[PDB]
């Protein structure tokens, strides 16, 4: 969990939303590195999301 630097348009919109609604930013990268939609788990255990 090394600290990376991420920026762009989405972070600017997030900062604007935080300033308008007095929020705070806790940006953290996803460990999976994917959107993580519905998928079939191994051995048909259960239905969950990643």
């Amino acid at each position: 969990t090394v600290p990376q630097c991420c920026y762009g348009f989405c972070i600017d919109l997030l900062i604007k939303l935080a300033r308008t609604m007095n929020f705070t930013y806790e940006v953290h990268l996803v460990a999976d590195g994917k959107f993580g939609t519905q998928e079939r788990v191994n051995n048909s255990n259960k239905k969950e999301w990643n």
Binding site: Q38, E39, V41, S44
Partner: protein, 49 residues
């Protein structure tokens, strides 16, 4: 038990080319657990029909 019996019934329904189903029960507390299990299995649609 009821929990595994519902799974067996659904596995049987998988064959015979059956996909649409509807169940009718009573107000007994034991039957409500079966209904809840069926609803959870329906919500568990990642695999199966």
């Amino acid at each position: 038990s009821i929990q595994q019996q519902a799974t067996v019934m659904l596995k049987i329904m998988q064959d015979y080319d059956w996909h649409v189903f509807s169940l009718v029960t009573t107000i007994f507390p034991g039957y409500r657990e079966f209904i809840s299990f069926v609803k959870t299995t329906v919500d568990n649609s990642f695999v199966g029909w």
